[PDB]
């Protein structure tokens, strides 16, 4: 006959959600002086990750439907709106004309307006009214603007588990993306997670350590997105060959005269490395689909411009790169990009965040690690499966970094049938 | 606060019940929310401090934790002798405390003395 005894040091845990508090690396003190995107007075605590490997234990991770990505997406939106809020709202008909000096079709328009003057805009930020040109979302969405002294840029933002909770991680190199993970380890503070805020491609992402990883809830169903993680990143480089002044109570900012030749940023990517990466991707896909099905890579289907193009942040500006060339192949280097100022960033009505013009060239180098691929219909049985890129919901972009984490509440109290009475 | 619901009931019912027992920064009226959060954490910290002091008293009375603790000092006659049935069956805890409020200091002193004597004569042998 055994007796019940309760222990209060048991390491049993159970999954639960919790508002994780951000903590940027120490060196952010040197950058946060600029009031940048890089965190705020919202707990910039100095972290120190101390990994502790477990043993003989397998936990069932599920990166899909993982609350931490929703939590950190909400945190990022809160940080963005906190940075944007102190800045001045615009709240403004503009007479526009076609002006070009050495371009090439000219997107730029010389808009004019009378106040008690002249500026240059882009076709993507204005519509014809009845010539008369009015910038989009004029009477509906508070356009607002950003303070040019914020200079938003991504930074690592570690997540440290609260006092009573633990953050598990899957050290297994070839992580399936779901199911048991034989290589699990607790970690006080997550690694340098970075706010990529990029569409249809992943910039400054996390590299894998074996063949390019494929992951999705179903690879079968074509409704759910497909996340691809690279191993040999391909570089993307281009500038903003332009300069503009700042106009001026009537605290209104706009563009000015352009110095030098006018031409859109073409941007470049190594072609052989891109082909090799796509070959690795197709090799991995054949494993999940079959070693004989024809695979295709067409261009984005359409819809909002944020999903048709590849949108990314660069040096206080935003580039929308036509990505027809990169995803164009059928298996058995340059890509034009537009620029626009009003940014319906997180598909939210009422926010535009008019980007102030940048002065000079930037030449941001950004090396790609991840793809978002959405399949096509499966009417053609075993004939072909096309993989047009798409997406745009940033939850995927952040699930690319939080696939190897899970918050667990420690349940120290436990019972056991030992041989001892009182 | 929180455990006021059981008030007004019989000591039997009260004893049985006690035995069983990411916000963004876009919210409107932020100052009221943060001030009332300050107040709520003040309340919770004062609650944990009051609980710690009460547990220290229970420990000095030889009970440590526990809720229904039993001791060894007899119930004196002067402390409002009444029939136990009507004490524990009809009236409520608030009225009982109002009735015994005049004597609680003597109760605590006798309880501490009894526990100290129990410790002394238990460590004696």
């Amino acid at each position, epitope marked *: 006959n055994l007796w019940v005894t309760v222990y209060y040091g048991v390491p049993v845990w159970k999954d639960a959600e919790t508002t994780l508090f951000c903590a940027s690396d120490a060196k952010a003190y040197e950058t946060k002086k600029h009031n940048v995107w890089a965190t705020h007075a919202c707990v910039p605590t100095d972290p120190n990750p101390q990994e502790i490997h477990l043993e003989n234990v397998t936990e069932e991770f599920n990166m899909w439907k993982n609350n931490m990505v929703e939590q950190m997406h909400t945190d990022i939106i809160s940080l963005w709106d906190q940075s944007l809020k102190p800045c001045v709202k615009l709240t403004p008909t503009l007479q526009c004309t076609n002006v070009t000096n050495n371009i090439t079709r000219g997107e730029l328009k010389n808009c004019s307006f009378n106040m008690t003057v002249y500026s240059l805009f882009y076709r993507l930020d204005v519509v014809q009214i009845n010539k008369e040109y009015r910038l989009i979302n004029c009477n509906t969405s508070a356009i607002t603007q950003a303070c040019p002294k914020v200079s938003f840029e991504p930074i690592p933002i570690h997540y440290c588990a609260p006092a009573g909770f633990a953050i598990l991680k899957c050290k297994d190199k070839k992580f399936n993306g779901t199911g048991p993970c034989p290589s699990v380890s607790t970690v006080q503070c997550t690694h340098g997670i970075k706010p990529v805020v990029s569409t249809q491609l992943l910039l400054n992402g996390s590299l894998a350590e074996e063949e390019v990883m494929i992951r999705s809830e179903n690879i079968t169903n074509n409704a759910k997105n497909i996340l691809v993680q690279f191993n040999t990143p391909v570089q993307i480089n281009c500038t903003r060959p332009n300069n503009n002044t700042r106009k001026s109570g009537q605290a209104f900012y706009a563009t000015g005269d352009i110095i030098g030749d006018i031409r859109q940023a073409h941007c470049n990517v190594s072609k052989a490395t891109w082909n090799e990466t796509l070959g690795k991707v197709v090799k991995q896909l054949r494993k999940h689909f079959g070693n004989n099905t024809i695979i295709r890579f067409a261009n984005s289907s359409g819809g909002d411009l944020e999903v048709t193009t590849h949108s990314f942040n660069c040096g206080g500006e935003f580039f929308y790169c036509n990505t027809s060339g990169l995803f164009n192949s059928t298996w058995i280097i340059t890509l034009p990009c537009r620029i626009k100022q009003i940014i319906n960033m997180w598909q939210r009505i009422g926010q535009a965040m008019y980007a102030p013009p940048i002065q000079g060239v930037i030449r941001c180098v950004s090396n790609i690690t991840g793809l978002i691929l959405t*399949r096509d219909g499966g009417s053609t049985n075993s004939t072909t499966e096309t993989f047009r890129p798409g997406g745009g919901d940033m939850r995927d972009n952040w699930r690319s970094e939080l696939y190897k984490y899970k918050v667990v509440k420690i349940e120290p109290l436990g019972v056991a049938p030992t041989r001892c009475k009182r | 606060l929180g455990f006021l619901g059981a008030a007004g009931s019989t000591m039997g019912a009260a004893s049985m019940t006690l035995t069983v027992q990411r916000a*963004p920064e876009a919210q409107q009226h932020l100052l009221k929310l943060t001030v009332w959060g300050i107040k709520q954490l003040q309340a919770r910290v004062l609650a944990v401090e009051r609980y710690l002091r009460d547990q220290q008293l229970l420990g000095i009375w030889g009970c440590s934790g526990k809720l229904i603790c039993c001791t060894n000092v007899p119930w004196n006659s002067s402390w409002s002798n009444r029939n136990l049935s009507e004490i524990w069956d009809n009236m409520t805890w608030l009225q009982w405390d109002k009735e015994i409020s005049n004597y609680t200091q003597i109760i605590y002193g006798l309880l501490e003395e009894s526990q100290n004597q129990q410790e002394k004569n238990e460590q004696d042998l």
Partner: antibody, heavy 123, light 111 residues
Framework: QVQLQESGPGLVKPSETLSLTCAVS????????WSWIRQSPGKGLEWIGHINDYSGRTDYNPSLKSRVTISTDTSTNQFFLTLSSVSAADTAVYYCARRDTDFWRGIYVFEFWGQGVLVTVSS | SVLTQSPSASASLGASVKLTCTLS???????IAWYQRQRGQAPRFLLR???????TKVDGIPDRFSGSSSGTERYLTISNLQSEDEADYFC?????????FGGGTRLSVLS
């Protein structure tokens, strides 16, 4: 499986706030997006608003920003729609639905709709 | 941007009907979704539909429902019409965070 069931007043006189409560069973624990939609009689339906079940962030149609407020209740798995200053033209069949979390090539759809409740504005 | 579509259409039982949804000029390559609302029952999500006819699927719907695309037009084709097809089918899209709905095709079957 997600089930939406809505209720509220059937007859509402002009010029006050109309309150409609939609409860949900079997919805995801968090990260959900609950949307209120209405269809005026004999005219194409229009979107009213939507609430993020976790963040608490709301959003509304630009032409109904002031008159519409959507609140959530995680404890009872419910959300409340309040339409301030209802007019005679706001009579409609109201649906509470859940908008998906896939964003397939630039669409958000409402897989799970409510049964619909008819609200008529009369004397 | 308005989702122009035919107000009414009908066909005999057991035949195939082809409901149409025409996008505006500014929504040439936009992808849409089809919604079916029977009499009294809650609206039921049917299928998405993109520029090249690549359409998703959902459980609980008959396989007879099919989608197709042609430039600025999207066609919902139904084969082997039943009595339960008495309904209203409308097309919906998402340009910005604001949804845009069609007028609703009242589709009826003949007994």
């Amino acid at each position: 499986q997600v089930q939406l069931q809505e209720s509220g007043p059937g007859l509402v006189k002009p010029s006050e706030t109309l309150s409609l409560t939609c409860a949900v069973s079997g919805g995801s624990i968090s990260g959900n997006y609950w949307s209120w939609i209405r269809q005026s009689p004999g005219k194409g339906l229009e979107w009213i608003g939507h609430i993020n079940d976790y963040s608490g962030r709301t959003d509304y149609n630009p032409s109904l920003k002031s008159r519409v407020t959507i609140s959530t209740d995680t404890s009872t798995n419910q959300f409340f729609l309040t339409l301030s200053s209802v007019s005679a033209a706001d009579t409609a069949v109201y649906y509470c639905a859940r908008r998906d979390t896939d964003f397939w090539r630039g669409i958000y759809v409402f897989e799970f709709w409510g049964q619909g409740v008819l609200v008529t504005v009369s004397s | 941007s308005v989702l122009t579509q035919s107000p009414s259409a009908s066909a005999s039982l057991g035949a195939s009907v082809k409901l149409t949804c025409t996008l505006s000029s500014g929504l040439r390559s936009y992808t849409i979704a089809w919604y079916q609302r029977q009499r009294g029952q809650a609206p039921r999500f049917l299928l998405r539909l993109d520029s090249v006819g690549s359409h998703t699927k959902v459980d609980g719907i008959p396989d007879r429902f099919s989608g197709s695309s042609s430039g600025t037009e999207r066609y919902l084709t139904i084969s082997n019409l039943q009595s339960e097809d008495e309904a209203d089918y409308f097309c919906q899209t998402w340009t910005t965070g604001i949804y845009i709905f069609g007028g609703g095709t009242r589709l009826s079957v003949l007994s």
